[PDB]
């Protein structure tokens, strides 16, 4: 009120300088930004062949969380942990005269691509996890097919980084179980089943299903409006 005054302001073309708005939709990104964006786009416009696109079908957040939960109980030794174990066996074994078996049979997650592969091949794994990233996708594309043939129940999972966490590397590519303490075989059968029902069983049908072929949405609206109107008046 006082000697204060309502002025409004008219931004209606022809007058008043435009205000500051969010041009974020318009900013001229650095090329590296523009490329990786359009890579994802271009990747989706093309019709991607079935043996890719069987990926993208990531495990669901609930089951996975339940699966990381288990796998976490099986992390590989830590630097300390192993150092500690050594001095335990290195001292004790050599004197107590045990057969290099004053160490308990370790149960941990198997990893590394080449490791896990011969494992699957030798029917020793019981649950392979495969990341959905993995940029030369080839390191990994033969795995569902493989795991299928070896009757080894597997799951494609969000997170090469996250497979990396549970194994102490930045990344991982694959994480696998072969062994397990009896206190856990229970929830692993359970786990294996959800997974088996989402992947291994569905593998044959997924194999027939090409992917991609998706329009951008300026084009989508174009034919959602052209195809609404044309046929049904």
């Amino acid at each position: 009120n006082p000697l204060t005054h309502s002025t409004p302001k008219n931004f209606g073309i022809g007058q008043a300088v435009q205000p500051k708005r969010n041009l974020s939709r318009y900013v001229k990104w650095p090329e590296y930004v523009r490329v990786q964006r359009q890579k994802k786009i271009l990747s989706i416009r093309l019709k991607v062949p079935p043996t890719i696109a069987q990926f993208q079908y990531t495990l669901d957040r609930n089951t996975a969380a339940e699966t990381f939960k288990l796998f976490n109980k099986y992390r590989p030794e830590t630097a300390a942990e192993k150092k500690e174990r050594l001095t335990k066996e290195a001292a004790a074994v050599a004197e107590g005269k045990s057969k290099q078996d004053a160490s308990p049979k370790p149960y941990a997650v198997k990893y590394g691509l080449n490791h896990v592969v011969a494992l699957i091949e030798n029917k020793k794994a019981k649950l392979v996890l495969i990341a959905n990233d993995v940029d030369p996708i080839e390191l990994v594309v033969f795995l569902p097919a493989l795991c299928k043939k070896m009757g080894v129940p597997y799951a494609i999972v969000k997170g090469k980084a996250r497979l990396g966490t549970l194994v102490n590397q930045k990344t991982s590519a694959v994480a696998a179980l072969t062994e397990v303490r009896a206190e856990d075989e229970a929830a692993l059968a359970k786990l294996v089943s959800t997974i088996d029902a989402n992947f291994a069983d569905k593998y044959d049908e997924v194999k027939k299903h090409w992917g991609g072929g998706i329009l951008g949405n300026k084009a989508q609206a174009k034919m959602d409006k052209r195809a609404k109107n044309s046929d049904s008046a």
């Binding site: 073309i13 022809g14 300088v17 435009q18």
Partner: protein, 252 residues
């Protein structure tokens, strides 16, 4: 023999343009938000000579919609526009001399200038003193608009291609005999190094297809094929008829 003249022009050395004095490049406003949703006002602050150009330019200044400042444009002055006049640019603008409108928004028979070939190219068609184009058609679906260019040719372009109402100023310039050699001289002095012109037929063979002989003569058909090759094409290139044009011209 030697490289003939019309192939030397290409490396542009002495043949580049005499640009030092020109006002700048004539162009329409950039096809921004204003000009393509509504209109936008300006003032012709000055209309002025451009060296080596027939037609005068019109300096026209506009507010920046996005910043507090003046932004000046260089227009080719249509006949009749005057300093201090308001110029209107936009789809929703009104049809008077000076204003700039998209060929879609102006009826058949509108007479416009400096028109774009594709929307936004900031002005391509009819800019020489006197010239203009006339809208002769519209095709509401796929918005084309048909025009006749100064050459007589008819083209079709986007309805959004902008033009400016009226005709370019300074017309008639070429009705005036140049009278003497120097008046050409000074003309070309402010254009390019294209003048005067030795006839090839006055040259020697090293110089030209036409050179040599004990009398001056062209020695073979002076109509040369399109498939000719550089160093060959002097004469009447790809000429499809030849000789005194008797009878009314003018496209059907």
């Amino acid at each position: 023999g030697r490289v003939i003249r019309n192939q030397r022009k290409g490396a542009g050395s002495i043949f580049t343009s005499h640009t030092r004095l020109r006002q700048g490049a004539a162009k329409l406003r950039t096809l921004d938000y204003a000009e393509r949703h509504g209109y936008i006002r300006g003032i012709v602050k000055q209309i002025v000579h451009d060296s080596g150009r027939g037609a005068p330019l019109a300096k026209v200044v506009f507010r920046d919609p996005y910043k507090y400042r003046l932004r000046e444009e260089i227009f080719i002055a249509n006949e009749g526009v005057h300093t201090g006049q308001f110029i209107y640019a936009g789809k929703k603008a009104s049809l008077n001399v000076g204003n700039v409108l998209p060929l879609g928004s102006v009826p058949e028979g509108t007479i416009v200038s400096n028109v774009e070939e594709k929307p936004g190219d900031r002005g391509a068609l009819a800019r020489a003193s006197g010239n203009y184009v006339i809208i002769i058609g519209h095709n509401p679906d796929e918005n084309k608009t048909r025009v006749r260019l100064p050459s007589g040719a008819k083209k079709v372009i986007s309805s959004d291609a902008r033009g400016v109402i009226g005709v370019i100023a300074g017309g008639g310039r070429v009705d005036k005999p140049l009278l003497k050699a120097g008046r050409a001289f000074h003309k070309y002095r402010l254009k390019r190094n294209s003048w005067p012109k030795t006839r090839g037929v006055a040259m020697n063979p090293v110089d030209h297809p036409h050179g040599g002989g004990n009398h001056q003569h062209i020695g073979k058909a002076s109509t040369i094929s399109r498939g000719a090759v550089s160093g060959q094409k002097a004469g009447l290139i790809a000429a499809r008829r030849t000789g005194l044009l008797r009878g009314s011209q003018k496209t059907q």
